[PDB]
Design a protein around this ligand. Structure first.
Ligand code: PFU
Ligand code: PFU
Lengths: 257, 257
Protein backbone atom coordinates (compact mmCIF):
# COMPACT_ATOMS: atom_id res chain seq x y z
CA UNK A 1 0.00 0.00 0.00
CA UNK A 2 1.17 3.53 -0.87
CA UNK A 3 2.68 5.86 1.73
CA UNK A 4 2.32 9.65 1.73
CA UNK A 5 5.35 11.84 1.12
CA UNK A 6 5.36 12.61 4.87
CA UNK A 7 5.45 8.95 5.84
CA UNK A 8 8.11 8.21 3.20
CA UNK A 9 10.23 10.96 4.87
CA UNK A 10 10.34 8.68 7.96
CA UNK A 11 11.30 5.39 6.29
CA UNK A 12 14.20 3.51 7.99
CA UNK A 13 16.48 3.66 4.93
CA UNK A 14 15.63 7.22 3.82
CA UNK A 15 18.51 9.50 2.87
CA UNK A 16 18.62 12.78 4.80
CA UNK A 17 18.33 14.86 1.58
CA UNK A 18 15.33 12.76 0.45
CA UNK A 19 13.70 13.16 3.87
CA UNK A 20 14.18 16.95 3.81
CA UNK A 21 12.65 17.07 0.32
CA UNK A 22 9.71 14.83 1.19
CA UNK A 23 8.92 16.84 4.30
CA UNK A 24 8.83 20.18 2.44
CA UNK A 25 6.78 18.63 -0.40
CA UNK A 26 4.20 17.55 2.20
CA UNK A 27 4.33 20.88 4.10
CA UNK A 28 3.99 23.06 1.00
CA UNK A 29 1.71 20.75 -1.05
CA UNK A 30 4.08 20.83 -4.01
CA UNK A 31 5.72 18.10 -6.08
CA UNK A 32 6.79 20.56 -8.80
CA UNK A 33 10.47 21.05 -9.76
CA UNK A 34 10.99 24.24 -11.80
CA UNK A 35 13.53 23.71 -14.60
CA UNK A 36 14.96 27.27 -14.53
CA UNK A 37 16.15 27.29 -18.10
CA UNK A 38 17.35 30.87 -18.54
CA UNK A 39 20.66 32.44 -19.46
CA UNK A 40 20.51 35.48 -17.14
CA UNK A 41 21.32 35.33 -13.43
CA UNK A 42 18.83 38.13 -12.71
CA UNK A 43 16.02 36.16 -14.38
CA UNK A 44 17.03 32.98 -12.54
CA UNK A 45 16.87 34.78 -9.20
CA UNK A 46 13.63 36.64 -9.96
CA UNK A 47 12.01 33.30 -10.90
CA UNK A 48 13.43 31.59 -7.82
CA UNK A 49 12.00 34.26 -5.51
CA UNK A 50 8.55 34.54 -7.14
CA UNK A 51 8.03 30.79 -7.72
CA UNK A 52 9.84 29.58 -4.59
CA UNK A 53 6.60 29.04 -2.60
CA UNK A 54 5.15 26.95 -5.47
CA UNK A 55 8.08 24.53 -5.90
CA UNK A 56 9.80 21.72 -4.01
CA UNK A 57 12.95 22.02 -6.14
CA UNK A 58 14.68 24.35 -8.61
CA UNK A 59 16.74 22.60 -11.30
CA UNK A 60 19.66 24.53 -12.81
CA UNK A 61 21.97 24.25 -15.80
CA UNK A 62 24.65 26.64 -14.54
CA UNK A 63 26.72 25.97 -17.66
CA UNK A 64 24.11 27.92 -19.67
CA UNK A 65 24.22 30.98 -17.39
CA UNK A 66 26.01 33.76 -19.27
CA UNK A 67 26.87 35.53 -16.04
CA UNK A 68 27.47 32.70 -13.60
CA UNK A 69 29.42 33.59 -10.46
CA UNK A 70 29.57 31.84 -7.12
CA UNK A 71 27.86 34.94 -5.64
CA UNK A 72 24.81 34.20 -7.83
CA UNK A 73 24.66 30.73 -6.27
CA UNK A 74 24.92 32.23 -2.77
CA UNK A 75 21.88 34.39 -3.59
CA UNK A 76 20.06 31.31 -4.93
CA UNK A 77 20.80 29.48 -1.67
CA UNK A 78 19.33 32.41 0.32
CA UNK A 79 16.08 32.00 -1.68
CA UNK A 80 16.09 28.19 -1.39
CA UNK A 81 16.38 28.52 2.40
CA UNK A 82 13.72 31.28 2.64
CA UNK A 83 11.16 29.57 0.45
CA UNK A 84 12.18 25.97 1.31
CA UNK A 85 13.18 24.20 -1.89
CA UNK A 86 16.19 22.11 -2.92
CA UNK A 87 18.70 23.10 -5.59
CA UNK A 88 19.33 20.41 -8.23
CA UNK A 89 22.17 21.02 -10.71
CA UNK A 90 21.26 19.02 -13.80
CA UNK A 91 24.87 18.29 -14.82
CA UNK A 92 24.34 14.69 -16.00
CA UNK A 93 27.80 13.54 -14.92
CA UNK A 94 28.77 10.81 -17.35
CA UNK A 95 32.50 10.23 -17.26
CA UNK A 96 34.82 7.80 -15.49
CA UNK A 97 34.85 8.09 -11.70
CA UNK A 98 38.19 9.86 -11.42
CA UNK A 99 37.05 12.65 -13.76
CA UNK A 100 33.56 13.24 -12.37
CA UNK A 101 34.94 13.69 -8.88
CA UNK A 102 36.83 16.75 -10.10
CA UNK A 103 33.95 18.03 -12.25
CA UNK A 104 31.69 17.90 -9.18
CA UNK A 105 33.99 19.55 -6.63
CA UNK A 106 36.20 21.82 -8.67
CA UNK A 107 36.56 24.06 -11.67
CA UNK A 108 34.79 27.43 -11.89
CA UNK A 109 31.39 26.09 -10.84
CA UNK A 110 32.24 24.25 -7.60
CA UNK A 111 28.92 22.44 -8.00
CA UNK A 112 29.14 20.42 -4.77
CA UNK A 113 29.46 23.67 -2.74
CA UNK A 114 25.90 24.82 -3.59
CA UNK A 115 23.88 21.96 -5.18
CA UNK A 116 21.80 19.79 -2.83
CA UNK A 117 21.27 17.30 -5.66
CA UNK A 118 23.05 16.38 -8.87
CA UNK A 119 22.42 13.64 -11.39
CA UNK A 120 24.44 11.12 -13.34
CA UNK A 121 24.14 8.84 -16.30
CA UNK A 122 24.79 5.16 -15.55
CA UNK A 123 26.50 4.31 -18.86
CA UNK A 124 30.08 4.44 -17.42
CA UNK A 125 29.27 1.75 -14.80
CA UNK A 126 29.17 2.29 -11.06
CA UNK A 127 32.49 4.11 -10.92
CA UNK A 128 30.59 7.25 -11.92
CA UNK A 129 28.66 6.99 -8.63
CA UNK A 130 31.73 6.07 -6.56
CA UNK A 131 33.65 9.05 -7.92
CA UNK A 132 30.83 11.49 -7.15
CA UNK A 133 30.22 10.04 -3.70
CA UNK A 134 33.85 10.64 -2.72
CA UNK A 135 32.97 14.33 -2.91
CA UNK A 136 29.21 14.20 -2.18
CA UNK A 137 29.15 12.04 0.95
CA UNK A 138 31.40 14.31 3.03
CA UNK A 139 29.39 17.28 1.77
CA UNK A 140 26.07 15.59 2.79
CA UNK A 141 24.69 15.73 -0.79
CA UNK A 142 22.48 13.43 -2.81
CA UNK A 143 22.46 12.09 -6.38
CA UNK A 144 19.78 11.03 -8.88
CA UNK A 145 20.47 8.37 -11.52
CA UNK A 146 19.08 8.77 -15.01
CA UNK A 147 17.14 5.54 -15.57
CA UNK A 148 15.02 6.67 -18.54
CA UNK A 149 14.95 9.67 -20.88
CA UNK A 150 12.02 11.58 -22.36
CA UNK A 151 13.60 12.19 -25.75
CA UNK A 152 12.98 10.39 -29.03
CA UNK A 153 15.34 7.47 -29.59
CA UNK A 154 16.36 7.19 -25.93
CA UNK A 155 18.55 4.13 -25.29
CA UNK A 156 17.76 4.22 -21.55
CA UNK A 157 15.31 1.31 -21.75
CA UNK A 158 15.09 -2.37 -20.82
CA UNK A 159 18.25 -3.75 -19.23
CA UNK A 160 19.79 -0.24 -19.13
CA UNK A 161 16.96 0.97 -16.89
CA UNK A 162 17.29 -2.13 -14.70
CA UNK A 163 21.04 -1.49 -14.38
CA UNK A 164 20.31 2.07 -13.19
CA UNK A 165 17.92 0.75 -10.54
CA UNK A 166 20.46 -1.83 -9.34
CA UNK A 167 23.17 0.84 -9.22
CA UNK A 168 20.96 3.14 -7.13
CA UNK A 169 19.85 0.43 -4.73
CA UNK A 170 23.55 -0.54 -4.14
CA UNK A 171 24.66 3.08 -3.50
CA UNK A 172 21.75 4.10 -1.26
CA UNK A 173 24.05 6.11 1.02
CA UNK A 174 24.30 8.73 -1.76
CA UNK A 175 21.76 7.92 -4.50
CA UNK A 176 18.31 9.17 -3.47
CA UNK A 177 16.31 8.45 -6.60
CA UNK A 178 15.90 8.60 -10.35
CA UNK A 179 15.26 10.76 -13.31
CA UNK A 180 12.72 8.56 -15.08
CA UNK A 181 9.43 8.61 -17.00
CA UNK A 182 7.71 6.22 -14.59
CA UNK A 183 8.20 4.51 -11.24
CA UNK A 184 11.17 2.21 -11.88
CA UNK A 185 11.95 1.09 -8.34
CA UNK A 186 9.56 -0.66 -5.98
CA UNK A 187 11.45 0.72 -2.97
CA UNK A 188 9.57 3.72 -1.54
CA UNK A 189 12.77 5.29 -0.16
CA UNK A 190 13.70 6.36 -3.71
CA UNK A 191 12.39 9.45 -5.40
CA UNK A 192 11.15 9.49 -8.99
CA UNK A 193 11.50 12.82 -10.86
CA UNK A 194 10.04 13.07 -14.34
CA UNK A 195 10.99 15.65 -17.01
CA UNK A 196 9.27 15.89 -20.42
CA UNK A 197 6.11 17.32 -18.88
CA UNK A 198 3.56 19.81 -20.27
CA UNK A 199 -0.20 20.23 -19.86
CA UNK A 200 -0.81 19.85 -23.63
CA UNK A 201 0.29 17.02 -25.92
CA UNK A 202 3.33 17.67 -28.08
CA UNK A 203 7.10 17.96 -28.18
CA UNK A 204 9.86 20.23 -29.43
CA UNK A 205 11.84 20.26 -32.68
CA UNK A 206 14.89 18.52 -31.15
CA UNK A 207 13.40 15.26 -29.89
CA UNK A 208 11.76 16.31 -26.60
CA UNK A 209 8.40 14.57 -26.01
CA UNK A 210 5.77 15.62 -23.45
CA UNK A 211 3.33 13.84 -21.20
CA UNK A 212 0.89 15.43 -18.77
CA UNK A 213 1.28 15.77 -15.01
CA UNK A 214 -1.79 13.52 -14.55
CA UNK A 215 -0.25 10.85 -16.78
CA UNK A 216 3.20 10.80 -15.17
CA UNK A 217 2.20 11.23 -11.51
CA UNK A 218 -1.06 9.26 -11.72
CA UNK A 219 -0.75 6.42 -14.21
CA UNK A 220 3.06 6.22 -14.30
CA UNK A 221 3.52 6.56 -10.52
CA UNK A 222 6.24 9.21 -10.46
CA UNK A 223 6.71 11.63 -7.54
CA UNK A 224 7.81 14.93 -8.96
CA UNK A 225 7.36 16.71 -12.29
CA UNK A 226 10.21 18.73 -13.82
CA UNK A 227 8.88 21.53 -16.03
CA UNK A 228 10.92 24.00 -18.09
CA UNK A 229 9.34 25.74 -21.12
CA UNK A 230 5.78 24.96 -20.00
CA UNK A 231 6.45 27.51 -17.29
CA UNK A 232 9.39 29.59 -18.51
CA UNK A 233 7.88 30.54 -21.89
CA UNK A 234 4.52 31.56 -20.37
CA UNK A 235 3.76 35.24 -19.94
CA UNK A 236 2.87 34.78 -16.26
CA UNK A 237 5.36 32.26 -14.88
CA UNK A 238 3.81 32.31 -11.42
CA UNK A 239 0.36 31.33 -12.66
CA UNK A 240 1.92 28.67 -14.90
CA UNK A 241 3.84 27.24 -11.94
CA UNK A 242 0.62 27.17 -9.92
CA UNK A 243 -1.17 25.32 -12.73
CA UNK A 244 1.56 22.68 -12.83
CA UNK A 245 1.71 22.47 -9.03
CA UNK A 246 -2.04 21.84 -8.73
CA UNK A 247 -1.97 19.27 -11.53
CA UNK A 248 0.90 17.27 -10.02
CA UNK A 249 -0.34 17.58 -6.46
CA UNK A 250 -3.94 16.43 -7.23
CA UNK A 251 -2.61 13.56 -9.26
CA UNK A 252 -0.53 12.44 -6.29
CA UNK A 253 -3.46 12.77 -3.85
CA UNK A 254 -5.74 10.76 -6.13
CA UNK A 255 -3.17 7.98 -6.53
CA UNK A 256 -2.73 7.89 -2.74
CA UNK A 257 -6.50 7.53 -2.25
CA UNK B 1 42.59 -3.28 -47.71
CA UNK B 2 43.70 -0.61 -45.22
CA UNK B 3 44.42 2.96 -46.18
CA UNK B 4 47.04 5.18 -44.57
CA UNK B 5 45.98 8.23 -42.57
CA UNK B 6 47.06 10.39 -45.54
CA UNK B 7 44.89 8.49 -47.99
CA UNK B 8 41.96 8.48 -45.56
CA UNK B 9 42.29 12.31 -45.48
CA UNK B 10 41.33 12.26 -49.19
CA UNK B 11 38.29 9.98 -48.99
CA UNK B 12 35.18 11.28 -50.84
CA UNK B 13 32.99 11.42 -47.69
CA UNK B 14 35.67 12.73 -45.29
CA UNK B 15 34.69 15.60 -43.00
CA UNK B 16 36.96 18.64 -43.25
CA UNK B 17 37.90 18.39 -39.55
CA UNK B 18 38.77 14.70 -39.94
CA UNK B 19 40.80 15.46 -43.07
CA UNK B 20 42.78 18.19 -41.27
CA UNK B 21 43.46 15.80 -38.37
CA UNK B 22 44.49 12.91 -40.61
CA UNK B 23 46.81 15.14 -42.63
CA UNK B 24 48.66 16.39 -39.52
CA UNK B 25 48.83 12.88 -38.04
CA UNK B 26 50.58 11.71 -41.21
CA UNK B 27 52.85 14.77 -41.41
CA UNK B 28 53.94 14.66 -37.77
CA UNK B 29 53.94 10.87 -37.35
CA UNK B 30 51.67 11.07 -34.35
CA UNK B 31 48.40 9.43 -33.39
CA UNK B 32 48.65 10.47 -29.74
CA UNK B 33 45.94 12.64 -28.10
CA UNK B 34 47.18 14.14 -24.80
CA UNK B 35 44.47 14.14 -22.14
CA UNK B 36 45.56 17.36 -20.42
CA UNK B 37 44.06 16.52 -17.06
CA UNK B 38 45.28 19.41 -14.90
CA UNK B 39 43.57 22.11 -12.87
CA UNK B 40 45.95 25.05 -13.57
CA UNK B 41 45.86 27.06 -16.79
CA UNK B 42 49.63 27.61 -16.60
CA UNK B 43 50.29 23.89 -16.46
CA UNK B 44 47.84 23.25 -19.31
CA UNK B 45 49.61 25.77 -21.51
CA UNK B 46 53.14 24.66 -20.55
CA UNK B 47 52.15 21.06 -21.45
CA UNK B 48 50.51 22.16 -24.70
CA UNK B 49 53.63 24.04 -25.79
CA UNK B 50 56.20 21.40 -24.79
CA UNK B 51 54.19 18.37 -26.03
CA UNK B 52 52.57 20.08 -29.02
CA UNK B 53 55.06 18.59 -31.53
CA UNK B 54 54.39 15.08 -30.17
CA UNK B 55 50.58 15.11 -30.35
CA UNK B 56 47.83 15.18 -32.97
CA UNK B 57 45.25 16.39 -30.44
CA UNK B 58 44.93 17.89 -26.97
CA UNK B 59 41.84 16.86 -25.02
CA UNK B 60 40.54 19.24 -22.37
CA UNK B 61 38.10 19.16 -19.46
CA UNK B 62 37.70 22.91 -19.10
CA UNK B 63 35.20 22.44 -16.27
CA UNK B 64 38.10 21.21 -14.09
CA UNK B 65 40.29 24.27 -14.73
CA UNK B 66 40.32 26.35 -11.55
CA UNK B 67 41.27 29.47 -13.49
CA UNK B 68 39.48 29.07 -16.80
CA UNK B 69 39.04 32.23 -18.85
CA UNK B 70 38.40 32.65 -22.55
CA UNK B 71 41.87 34.24 -22.82
CA UNK B 72 43.37 30.91 -21.67
CA UNK B 73 41.63 29.24 -24.61
CA UNK B 74 42.93 31.96 -26.97
CA UNK B 75 46.47 31.08 -25.84
CA UNK B 76 45.71 27.36 -26.28
CA UNK B 77 44.56 28.07 -29.86
CA UNK B 78 47.83 29.92 -30.55
CA UNK B 79 49.73 26.77 -29.49
CA UNK B 80 47.43 24.42 -31.44
CA UNK B 81 48.05 26.50 -34.58
CA UNK B 82 51.84 26.72 -34.01
CA UNK B 83 52.36 23.06 -33.29
CA UNK B 84 49.50 21.74 -35.44
CA UNK B 85 47.11 19.81 -33.19
CA UNK B 86 43.35 19.87 -32.72
CA UNK B 87 41.59 20.90 -29.51
CA UNK B 88 39.00 18.36 -28.27
CA UNK B 89 36.77 19.39 -25.35
CA UNK B 90 35.72 16.20 -23.64
CA UNK B 91 32.35 17.52 -22.47
CA UNK B 92 30.32 14.34 -23.08
CA UNK B 93 27.13 16.18 -23.98
CA UNK B 94 24.32 13.94 -22.86
CA UNK B 95 21.11 15.96 -22.58
CA UNK B 96 18.12 16.60 -24.80
CA UNK B 97 18.88 18.42 -28.03
CA UNK B 98 17.47 21.74 -26.96
CA UNK B 99 19.67 21.82 -23.87
CA UNK B 100 22.95 20.67 -25.41
CA UNK B 101 22.70 23.35 -28.10
CA UNK B 102 22.98 25.99 -25.34
CA UNK B 103 25.64 24.12 -23.34
CA UNK B 104 27.79 23.97 -26.48
CA UNK B 105 27.47 27.58 -27.62
CA UNK B 106 26.84 29.56 -24.47
CA UNK B 107 27.45 29.92 -20.78
CA UNK B 108 30.87 30.94 -19.45
CA UNK B 109 32.82 28.37 -21.47
CA UNK B 110 31.55 29.13 -25.01
CA UNK B 111 32.94 25.72 -25.99
CA UNK B 112 32.03 25.95 -29.69
CA UNK B 113 34.12 29.16 -30.03
CA UNK B 114 37.43 27.31 -29.37
CA UNK B 115 36.95 23.52 -29.55
CA UNK B 116 37.59 21.84 -32.89
CA UNK B 117 35.99 18.64 -31.59
CA UNK B 118 33.53 17.74 -28.88
CA UNK B 119 31.91 14.45 -27.95
CA UNK B 120 28.49 13.21 -27.00
CA UNK B 121 26.82 10.24 -25.42
CA UNK B 122 24.15 8.60 -27.58
CA UNK B 123 21.77 7.65 -24.76
CA UNK B 124 19.34 10.54 -25.39
CA UNK B 125 18.75 9.51 -29.01
CA UNK B 126 19.77 11.41 -32.09
CA UNK B 127 18.36 14.70 -30.87
CA UNK B 128 21.61 15.15 -28.93
CA UNK B 129 23.48 15.24 -32.25
CA UNK B 130 20.86 17.40 -33.97
CA UNK B 131 21.04 19.96 -31.16
CA UNK B 132 24.84 20.12 -31.25
CA UNK B 133 24.91 20.30 -35.05
CA UNK B 134 22.69 23.46 -34.97
CA UNK B 135 25.67 25.21 -33.40
CA UNK B 136 28.54 23.05 -34.73
CA UNK B 137 27.77 22.99 -38.44
CA UNK B 138 27.78 26.79 -38.88
CA UNK B 139 30.99 26.95 -36.81
CA UNK B 140 32.67 24.24 -39.02
CA UNK B 141 33.20 21.90 -36.02
CA UNK B 142 33.17 18.15 -35.58
CA UNK B 143 31.75 15.73 -33.03
CA UNK B 144 32.72 12.25 -31.73
CA UNK B 145 30.12 9.75 -30.44
CA UNK B 146 30.86 7.65 -27.39
CA UNK B 147 30.29 4.11 -28.68
CA UNK B 148 32.12 2.22 -25.91
CA UNK B 149 33.63 3.09 -22.52
CA UNK B 150 36.82 1.88 -20.86
CA UNK B 151 35.41 1.76 -17.34
CA UNK B 152 34.24 -1.22 -15.31
CA UNK B 153 30.54 -1.91 -15.73
CA UNK B 154 30.19 0.14 -18.91
CA UNK B 155 26.73 -0.20 -20.46
CA UNK B 156 27.99 1.01 -23.86
CA UNK B 157 28.04 -2.49 -25.35
CA UNK B 158 26.07 -4.62 -27.80
CA UNK B 159 23.06 -2.87 -29.34
CA UNK B 160 24.07 0.39 -27.61
CA UNK B 161 27.37 0.45 -29.52
CA UNK B 162 25.55 -0.42 -32.76
CA UNK B 163 23.10 2.43 -32.17
CA UNK B 164 26.06 4.82 -31.78
CA UNK B 165 27.52 3.63 -35.08
CA UNK B 166 24.16 4.06 -36.85
CA UNK B 167 23.77 7.56 -35.36
CA UNK B 168 27.25 8.59 -36.54
CA UNK B 169 26.82 7.11 -40.00
CA UNK B 170 23.49 9.06 -40.33
CA UNK B 171 24.96 12.43 -39.18
CA UNK B 172 28.19 12.32 -41.17
CA UNK B 173 28.10 16.03 -41.97
CA UNK B 174 29.02 16.66 -38.30
CA UNK B 175 30.01 13.35 -36.63
CA UNK B 176 33.59 12.49 -37.60
CA UNK B 177 34.14 9.38 -35.48
CA UNK B 178 33.99 7.63 -32.13
CA UNK B 179 35.30 7.33 -28.68
CA UNK B 180 35.62 3.56 -28.48
CA UNK B 181 37.87 0.72 -27.32
CA UNK B 182 38.07 -0.88 -30.76
CA UNK B 183 37.19 -0.31 -34.38
CA UNK B 184 33.39 -0.13 -34.36
CA UNK B 185 32.68 1.17 -37.85
CA UNK B 186 33.87 -0.40 -41.08
CA UNK B 187 33.74 2.96 -42.87
CA UNK B 188 37.28 4.41 -43.09
CA UNK B 189 36.02 8.01 -43.10
CA UNK B 190 35.37 7.69 -39.34
CA UNK B 191 38.10 8.19 -36.75
CA UNK B 192 38.40 5.86 -33.73
CA UNK B 193 39.87 7.40 -30.58
CA UNK B 194 40.59 5.16 -27.61
CA UNK B 195 41.01 6.23 -23.95
CA UNK B 196 41.96 3.86 -21.10
CA UNK B 197 45.49 3.51 -22.38
CA UNK B 198 48.76 2.98 -20.51
CA UNK B 199 51.96 1.04 -21.28
CA UNK B 200 51.59 -1.21 -18.20
CA UNK B 201 48.61 -3.37 -17.26
CA UNK B 202 46.37 -1.98 -14.54
CA UNK B 203 43.61 0.46 -13.72
CA UNK B 204 42.66 3.09 -11.17
CA UNK B 205 40.62 2.88 -7.97
CA UNK B 206 37.48 4.32 -9.57
CA UNK B 207 36.84 1.82 -12.35
CA UNK B 208 39.26 2.95 -15.06
CA UNK B 209 40.86 0.00 -16.89
CA UNK B 210 43.96 0.19 -19.12
CA UNK B 211 45.08 -1.49 -22.32
CA UNK B 212 48.35 -0.92 -24.15
CA UNK B 213 48.87 1.17 -27.28
CA UNK B 214 49.91 -1.99 -29.16
CA UNK B 215 46.70 -3.75 -28.13
CA UNK B 216 44.40 -0.83 -28.95
CA UNK B 217 45.93 0.35 -32.20
CA UNK B 218 47.19 -3.02 -33.47
CA UNK B 219 44.80 -5.77 -32.44
CA UNK B 220 41.72 -3.61 -31.80
CA UNK B 221 42.16 -1.47 -34.91
CA UNK B 222 41.70 1.96 -33.37
CA UNK B 223 43.36 5.12 -34.80
CA UNK B 224 44.33 7.34 -31.90
CA UNK B 225 45.23 6.78 -28.26
CA UNK B 226 44.05 9.17 -25.56
CA UNK B 227 46.43 9.19 -22.60
CA UNK B 228 46.05 11.16 -19.35
CA UNK B 229 47.84 9.98 -16.18
CA UNK B 230 50.29 7.78 -18.09
CA UNK B 231 51.79 11.04 -19.26
CA UNK B 232 50.63 13.71 -16.79
CA UNK B 233 51.82 11.90 -13.63
CA UNK B 234 55.26 11.12 -15.08
CA UNK B 235 58.19 13.23 -13.97
CA UNK B 236 59.21 14.02 -17.55
CA UNK B 237 55.96 14.53 -19.49
CA UNK B 238 57.75 15.13 -22.77
CA UNK B 239 59.61 11.81 -22.62
CA UNK B 240 56.39 10.06 -21.61
CA UNK B 241 54.50 11.61 -24.54
CA UNK B 242 57.27 10.44 -26.88
CA UNK B 243 57.07 6.91 -25.50
CA UNK B 244 53.31 6.84 -26.13
CA UNK B 245 53.67 8.45 -29.56
CA UNK B 246 56.24 5.87 -30.70
CA UNK B 247 54.15 3.01 -29.38
CA UNK B 248 50.93 4.10 -31.10
CA UNK B 249 52.63 5.12 -34.33
CA UNK B 250 54.58 1.90 -34.78
CA UNK B 251 51.44 -0.15 -33.96
CA UNK B 252 49.64 1.74 -36.74
CA UNK B 253 52.51 1.21 -39.21
CA UNK B 254 52.62 -2.52 -38.46
CA UNK B 255 48.86 -2.93 -38.89
CA UNK B 256 49.10 -1.04 -42.21
CA UNK B 257 51.73 -3.55 -43.37
N1 PFU C 1 16.48 12.84 -18.44
C1 PFU C 1 15.49 13.24 -19.24
O1 PFU C 1 14.66 12.47 -19.72
C2 PFU C 1 15.32 14.64 -19.49
N2 PFU C 1 14.44 15.23 -20.31
N3 PFU C 1 14.54 16.62 -20.16
C3 PFU C 1 15.49 16.99 -19.25
C4 PFU C 1 15.87 18.34 -18.80
O2 PFU C 1 14.71 18.88 -18.15
C5 PFU C 1 14.34 20.12 -18.77
C6 PFU C 1 13.15 19.85 -19.69
O3 PFU C 1 12.77 21.11 -20.21
P1 PFU C 1 11.38 21.38 -20.98
O4 PFU C 1 11.31 20.43 -22.16
O5 PFU C 1 11.56 22.81 -21.34
O6 PFU C 1 10.29 21.17 -19.98
C7 PFU C 1 15.56 20.57 -19.56
O7 PFU C 1 16.43 21.32 -18.71
C8 PFU C 1 16.23 19.27 -19.96
O8 PFU C 1 17.66 19.43 -20.05
C9 PFU C 1 15.98 15.71 -18.79
O9 PFU C 1 16.96 15.51 -17.79
N1 PFU D 1 35.79 5.22 -22.38
C1 PFU D 1 35.67 6.51 -22.35
O1 PFU D 1 34.84 7.16 -23.02
C2 PFU D 1 36.65 7.19 -21.52
N2 PFU D 1 37.58 6.70 -20.66
N3 PFU D 1 38.39 7.73 -20.15
C3 PFU D 1 38.04 8.94 -20.66
C4 PFU D 1 38.63 10.25 -20.41
O2 PFU D 1 39.97 10.21 -20.93
C5 PFU D 1 40.91 10.48 -19.88
C6 PFU D 1 41.51 9.16 -19.41
O3 PFU D 1 42.49 9.51 -18.45
P1 PFU D 1 43.62 8.50 -17.87
O4 PFU D 1 42.88 7.33 -17.29
O5 PFU D 1 44.31 9.37 -16.91
O6 PFU D 1 44.50 8.14 -19.02
C7 PFU D 1 40.12 11.17 -18.78
O7 PFU D 1 40.09 12.58 -19.05
C8 PFU D 1 38.75 10.56 -18.92
O8 PFU D 1 37.73 11.50 -18.51
C9 PFU D 1 36.94 8.61 -21.53
O9 PFU D 1 36.21 9.52 -22.36
Amino acid sequence: KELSFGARAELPRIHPVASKLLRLMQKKETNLCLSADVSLARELLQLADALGPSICMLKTHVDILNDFTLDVMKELITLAKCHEFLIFEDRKFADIGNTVKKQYEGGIFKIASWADLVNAHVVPGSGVVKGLQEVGLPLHRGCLLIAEMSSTGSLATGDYTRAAVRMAEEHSEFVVGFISGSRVSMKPEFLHLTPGVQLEAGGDNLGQQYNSPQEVIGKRGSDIIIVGRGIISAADRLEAAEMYRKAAWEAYLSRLG
